[PDB]
Amino acid sequence: LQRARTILEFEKMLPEWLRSRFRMGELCKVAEDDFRLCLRINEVKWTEWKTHVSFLNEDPGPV
Amino acid sequence: AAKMGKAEILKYILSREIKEKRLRSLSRKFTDWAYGPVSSSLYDLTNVDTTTDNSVLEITVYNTNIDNRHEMLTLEPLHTLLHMKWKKFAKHMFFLSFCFYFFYNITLTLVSYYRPREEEAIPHPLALTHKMGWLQLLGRMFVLIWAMCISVKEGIAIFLLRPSDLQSILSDAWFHFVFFIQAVLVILSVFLYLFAYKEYLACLVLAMALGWANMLYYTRGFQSMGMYSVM
Amino acid sequence: RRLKKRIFAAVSEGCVEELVELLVELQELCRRRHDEDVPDFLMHKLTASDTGKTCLMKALLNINPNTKEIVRILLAFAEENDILGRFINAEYTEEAYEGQTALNIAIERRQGDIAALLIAAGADVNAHAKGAFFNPKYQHEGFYFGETPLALAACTNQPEIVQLLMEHEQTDITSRDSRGNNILHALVTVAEDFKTQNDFVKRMYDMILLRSGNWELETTRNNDGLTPLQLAAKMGKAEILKYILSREIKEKRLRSLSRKFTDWAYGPVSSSLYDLTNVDTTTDNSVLEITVYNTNIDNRHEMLTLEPLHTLLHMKWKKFAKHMFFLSFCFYFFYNITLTLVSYYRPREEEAIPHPLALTHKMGWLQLLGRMFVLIWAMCISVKEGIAIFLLRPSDLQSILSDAWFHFVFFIQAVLVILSVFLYLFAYKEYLACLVLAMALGWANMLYYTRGFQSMGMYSVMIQKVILHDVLKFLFVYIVFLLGFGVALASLIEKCPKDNKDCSSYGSFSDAVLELFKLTIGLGDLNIQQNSKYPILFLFLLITYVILTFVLLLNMLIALMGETVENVSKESERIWRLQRARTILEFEKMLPEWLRSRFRMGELCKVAEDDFRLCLRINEVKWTEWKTHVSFLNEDPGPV
Ligand SMILES: CCCCCCCC/C=C/CCCCCCCC(=O)O[C@@H](COC(=O)CCCCCCCCCCCCCCC)COP(=O)([O-])OCC[N+](C)(C)C
Ligand SMILES: CCCCCCCC/C=C/CCCCCCCC(=O)O[C@@H](COC(=O)CCCCCCCCCCCCCCC)COP(=O)([O-])OCC[N+](C)(C)C
Ligand SMILES: CCCCCCCC/C=C\CCCCCCCC(=O)O[C@@H](COC(=O)CCCCCCCCCCCCCCC)COP(=O)([O-])OCC[N+](C)(C)C
Ligand SMILES: CCCCCCCC/C=C\CCCCCCCC(=O)O[C@@H](COC(=O)CCCCCCCCCCCCCCC)COP(=O)([O-])OCC[N+](C)(C)C
Ligand SMILES: CCCCCCCC/C=C\CCCCCCCC(=O)O[C@@H](COC(=O)CCCCCCCCCCCCCCC)COP(=O)([O-])OCC[N+](C)(C)C
Ligand SMILES: CCCCCCCC/C=C\CCCCCCCC(=O)O[C@@H](COC(=O)CCCCCCCCCCCCCCC)COP(=O)([O-])OCC[N+](C)(C)C
Ligand SMILES: CCCCCCCC/C=C\CCCCCCCC(=O)O[C@@H](COC(=O)CCCCCCCCCCCCCCC)COP(=O)([O-])OCC[N+](C)(C)C
Ligand SMILES: CCCCCCCC/C=C\CCCCCCCC(=O)O[C@@H](COC(=O)CCCCCCCCCCCCCCC)COP(=O)([O-])OCC[N+](C)(C)C
Ligand SMILES: CCCCCCCC/C=C\CCCCCCCC(=O)O[C@@H](COC(=O)CCCCCCCCCCCCCCC)COP(=O)([O-])OCC[N+](C)(C)C
Ligand SMILES: CCCCCCCC/C=C\CCCCCCCC(=O)O[C@@H](COC(=O)CCCCCCCCCCCCCCC)COP(=O)([O-])OCC[N+](C)(C)C
Ligand SMILES: CCCCCCCC/C=C\CCCCCCCC(=O)O[C@@H](COC(=O)CCCCCCCCCCCCCCC)COP(=O)([O-])OCC[N+](C)(C)C
Ligand SMILES: NCCOB(c1ccccc1)c1ccccc1
Ligand SMILES: NCCOB(c1ccccc1)c1ccccc1
Ligand SMILES: NCCOB(c1ccccc1)c1ccccc1
Ligand SMILES: NCCOB(c1ccccc1)c1ccccc1
């Protein structure tokens, strides 16, 4: 919690033009006319095996 | 859920993935692609990332009224956003803050104890004179500015411009005072010497003793060094 | 145009009835050409132009409840136009998907009924998906499974389709991809722990090996040059390496695929034989050699615990490695004493001090045998470590610099003995300075020989763990408490030039810091506290300095008890046994060719018809499970 306070106090020190450069997220079309700044986190799960029907891109890969 | 510390409700809302169609837009967790065991997820950051007035990441860290902030910042977007800010700019700013302050404590010692004079009616340090040299000129100019750059900035923090010292600073942020007191006593000892008082040396020793004492703030850059300083 | 996009969309949501007239509209346009362009033109309108995705690939990526009937319509249309062969065996033209077919899609989407229908329709069961997604760069840019449809069904836990593919006789089980891997190399790569996945990759290894029934799959090496037995030792896959190395097949006609054989059994007492073909250190790359010298994995203690790797590493210690370790101790303990006796046991008045190890006459055979022993043994280390660290296989990329730091300190101590002789003959003033650092490092290197005993060895690891990792935590907080009271006490100390008769101080700040060293180590006085400005105020900062020092010493003990007092004793016990395991295999390389054959383990055991293997015997007494014994080599029990 001492580091987590230190990170957010360093972000307030930055100017307006430099906070936009280090901004996280990307525009992802999650629905019809719904663009959200989403952040990607990958996961490798071996235990549960299901067929995949809920997805945004049918082509797998960071393209 | 971020203000009251309700971690199990805050875990559900922040990672809500609705599989059934026509209610897909009520989700905050989306799967972009999947191939066997490898899958890619997308976490919504509408009111979570620190780009608005009140965000979930800002409320959770600065909440000194709850006792479960470690259980709430462990959650997968709040963990990752707090980790990606460290790798981009916060580790570089923390090391850069260490370099200007470690040079600040040495220069206070070199102007106070590295001058052998017989008596010469002892001059107080940080007193800008001529005929001296650019080595000592760049030294005392660095100490004079950096003592004021802390005193003004901490003068914004503790005082009138959003003082925040009700219970916020006085609970988990006690380092704001000790950087402020050390910055004043450098400036105040110069004012006592120009006003011809006998307390110019006494305020300077407590300024240098508190200056090396405040080096324990920079122990939080490492985990093993940081956990040892908490004990 | 509009005709192409409607066919791609109709196979996506599941409009079965809409797809009917769209294939009729594609069929009504065929009667304006002849048979040279009609099979060509249908490939342009059923596939893409930039990626190569077909209508069959689009329907299988979108799993809908009408996915079974929609495949039967599209494949029947290709049969009527006699284009079924190039339709089902189509591939992506994309660089990140090159080689992926429609069969690779249906296997991953858990469609066993559709994948059985594609193979009967004529799909290629030996498709090689050589794209950039299926062969990643370092980690997690994709998913490497083996680039074959047999490996995709095996690595995604689909045992019904693996049995379907092996019965099909166009399936080449011994196929090798761009990485040189086959079906058994790829199962070692994707394998993980039992907590991580399951034990299913061990069961997939069992099913495929028994169907082949030969020693062709575990003998073939990849482009790197490793067997599937040697990838388990290189990558650190302990659960797969446990299964292969102790594989006992009970069912006959596949008995020769075993690496564990039972020689005899009588009730609870049984005798086993472990195969040592590529395990014992008699070839170039062996399992015992790869596992010990692998500084890229963090589970060497779990792999050398296994029953033949434990026993071979223990039998080498009892035969020659304990005797060589004690003999190395005796020549080096005599080496450190003789350096001291030639340097401090000579009382001479001045006589223009002679440097030691200088061979003169008229001296005696006591000192002659002494200095000749030191001169040779310093060169015997410097040449041998000159082979190790340097040109003759230097190996200092990450191998020596990770778990073998003793190679440098024996080398530096050997040079400084030789270099100090060279500085004295060249008439320089550094002959004595290099000799003291040679003797101080010589007694410091006696901690290498602590690994002969367990209790002595575990204690020396804890010393190396505190100094290299945990002392800089103590020091960096000590100096800020040193200089915190250092600038405070320096203003209290009255200046030394009061008399200047015995004044040899180094400054006001230097007097305050040096007294805080002496008061910590226990050599402090009270001469400055009496002759100070404020004597009572000078004492209270010294009392506070002791309290802060005791807090620093008391939190070092809590930090060395981090979260469990047992796990500190565990990590010093695991990495001690790797220091002995490296020491055993380095002593084996020192032996000549005729002497390694004398201490070789194993014996010829006829395990099958014309199958003689160097097996090692390990006895076992098991009381829990009671079975009748039908799998045995000798019907007469006993070591005869
Ligand atoms: C005359 C008597 C002789 C000396 C007495 C013995 C001195 C030995 C002192 C040793 C220091 C350690 C214990 C002190 C108290 C904790 C540190 C602190 O200030 O709080 C904060 C800063 O912590 C930092 O890391 C920044 C500065 C550290 C030292 C500040 C000076 C303290 C001495 C004062 C005067 C010394 C005299 C200087 C001359 C004027 C802790 O960080 P936080 O962000 O708030 O989060 C934790 C919240 N919590 C703690 C509430 C859980
Ligand atoms: C001037 C300052 C005053 C003295 C300072 C205090 C000295 C006190 C020192 C105390 C020794 C203990 C800590 C030292 C570092 C660890 C031991 C080591 O070297 O590595 C190896 C040697 O394995 C040995 O144990 C043999 C030699 C031990 C001492 C080597 C000299 C180090 C002194 C330095 C110069 C002293 C001056 C000598 C004169 C030139 C450890 O074995 P390993 O096979 O690599 O496996 C472990 C791998 N791991 C560690 C990466 C996990
Ligand atoms: C406008 C344009 C500007 C130009 C460009 C600007 C950019 C250039 C900026 C910077 C230049 C280049 C930097 C590159 C990255 C290095 C940063 C780094 O090392 O991180 C360190 C931060 O830094 C510190 O923590 C320093 C403080 C030392 C720790 C304790 C000593 C102090 C207390 C005792 C007193 C002793 C002192 C002596 C006695 C008084 C540590 O971070 P980390 O550990 O690596 O993080 C990993 C997290 N982990 C912990 C989980 C592992
Ligand atoms: C890293 C740990 C050790 C740190 C260094 C050891 C500490 C001290 C080193 C040595 C002890 C004393 C020997 C001489 C001191 C240097 C020169 C001098 O005399 O100072 C003079 C000015 O001083 C200043 O105003 C500027 C500071 C000078 C640079 C020294 C610290 C650099 C550390 C970088 C830190 C940045 C962070 C780095 C990233 C971590 C003092 O004035 P003077 O009385 O008139 O002296 C006359 C002599 N003269 C004419 C020749 C000038
Ligand atoms: C030189 C550079 C410096 C480097 C130093 C090292 C350099 C060399 C590197 C490594 C060698 C280290 C020493 C040898 C091995 C020691 C370990 C050991 O176990 O001892 C074994 C010695 O081995 C024997 O079997 C004894 C045979 C001696 C007869 C020699 C005559 C012919 C060889 C010609 C000789 C000249 C060579 C060829 C020249 C023409 C004894 O076995 P044991 O276990 O004790 O079993 C007894 C137990 N029991 C009685 C209960 C049954
Ligand atoms: C070419 C023909 C050659 C002729 C024939 C050649 C053959 C004849 C050869 C040899 C002659 C006969 C030997 C027979 C077997 C005895 C050896 C032995 O005991 O093994 C010892 C090895 O040896 C050492 O470890 C010595 C080092 C002592 C450790 C601590 C002192 C060093 C550091 C402190 C500094 C203090 C020193 C003073 C201050 C500087 C230990 O092994 P073990 O423990 O018994 O093994 C059991 C494993 N256990 C751990 C599970 C229990
Ligand atoms: C085991 C723990 C204790 C170790 C022993 C205690 C340490 C020391 C014992 C006593 C302290 C000093 C008293 C006299 C020293 C002996 C003789 C001498 O004078 O040395 C001389 C030569 O020295 C050499 O070159 C050879 C070494 C001599 C044998 C001594 C160590 C044997 C240990 C075996 C270890 C192997 C491994 C064993 C397995 C573990 C010194 O030369 P000098 O200055 O000209 O002296 C003139 C006197 N003189 C003419 C009479 C020669
Ligand atoms: C200018 C820049 C800033 C400079 C100031 C700061 C510099 C940084 C200084 C200390 C912080 C450590 C940073 C290392 C890398 C970061 C990763 C990390 O988390 O640290 C870890 C990596 O452990 C190490 O690598 C220790 C660093 C020393 C390496 C060897 C130097 C020789 C020691 C010479 C010694 C002196 C000779 C002795 C006699 C006099 C440390 O973790 P740990 O401590 O092992 O905790 C484990 C305990 N537990 C499992 C129970 C929890
Ligand atoms: C964690 C790291 C370490 C932490 C910090 C280390 C411990 C910090 C503790 C103490 C810091 C140092 C205290 C003394 C400083 C001045 C000494 C001096 O020079 O005396 C001189 C100045 O004379 C005076 O004016 C003051 C004399 C002492 C006043 C004592 C009050 C402070 C006690 C502590 C309470 C403070 C509360 C602190 C908060 C708890 C006397 O010299 P003179 O020639 O006879 O008189 C002529 C005057 N002239 C020279 C200017 C012309
Ligand atoms: C990594 C630390 C070790 C290396 C850096 C050393 C840092 C400095 C530490 C100690 C000083 C050692 C070198 C400086 C000058 C020589 C001696 C001296 O002090 O006396 C001088 C005045 O005496 C004073 O009163 C000056 C001391 C105050 C300024 C020095 C501390 C700087 C910041 C604190 C440390 C910040 C960094 C600490 C972070 C850990 C006069 O010298 P002399 O007595 O007449 O003798 C002649 C000198 N000669 C023979 C050498 C020619
Ligand atoms: C962690 C515990 C360590 C202490 C606090 C740690 C922080 C330390 C910081 C600041 C501490 C406070 C600084 C006080 C300065 C001394 C002034 C004084 O007393 O008058 C006189 C001494 O007269 C005496 O002799 C009094 C006896 C001294 C000890 C008291 C007995 C304790 C019994 C009760 C049990 C309670 C035990 C204590 C409470 C725990 C004069 O003393 P002087 O000034 O040196 O002489 C100069 C003359 N001049 C002024 C005319 C020039
Ligand atoms: N498992 C450790 C996760 O660490 B957390 C963390 C995240 C980013 C940077 C540094 C640490 C963390 C956990 C609770 C509160 C605050 C931060
Ligand atoms: N001195 C004005 C700001 O100080 B900084 C600062 C002040 C007190 C505590 C911690 C940091 C600073 C921040 C980032 C980089 C460099 C310095
Ligand atoms: N149960 C203790 C077995 O010890 B092992 C061992 C084997 C031979 C000689 C000495 C020790 C061992 C275990 C893991 C790694 C390396 C060696
Ligand atoms: N000095 C040349 C070889 O040294 B040996 C050696 C040198 C350094 C560290 C460990 C061993 C040696 C090995 C076995 C028996 C005797 C000596």
PDB file of N, CA, C and O in Angstrom, chain C residues 179 331 349 367:
ATOM      1  N   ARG C 179      10.412 -27.908 -36.317  1.00  0.00           N
ATOM      2  CA  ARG C 179      11.310 -27.959 -35.171  1.00  0.00           C
ATOM      3  C   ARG C 179      11.933 -29.334 -34.971  1.00  0.00           C
ATOM      4  O   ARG C 179      12.659 -29.530 -33.992  1.00  0.00           O
ATOM      5  N   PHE C 331      45.411 -32.369   0.224  1.00  0.00           N
ATOM      6  CA  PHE C 331      46.450 -31.625  -0.482  1.00  0.00           C
ATOM      7  C   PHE C 331      46.234 -30.122  -0.373  1.00  0.00           C
ATOM      8  O   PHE C 331      47.167 -29.339  -0.580  1.00  0.00           O
ATOM      9  N   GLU C 349      66.329 -10.757  11.558  1.00  0.00           N
ATOM     10  CA  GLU C 349      66.471  -9.402  12.087  1.00  0.00           C
ATOM     11  C   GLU C 349      66.084  -8.334  11.067  1.00  0.00           C
ATOM     12  O   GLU C 349      65.044  -7.686  11.221  1.00  0.00           O
ATOM     13  N   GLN C 367      62.480 -27.640   4.043  1.00  0.00           N
ATOM     14  CA  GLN C 367      61.946 -26.466   3.365  1.00  0.00           C
ATOM     15  C   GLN C 367      61.951 -26.661   1.853  1.00  0.00           C
ATOM     16  O   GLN C 367      61.243 -25.965   1.119  1.00  0.00           O
TER      17      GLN C 367
END
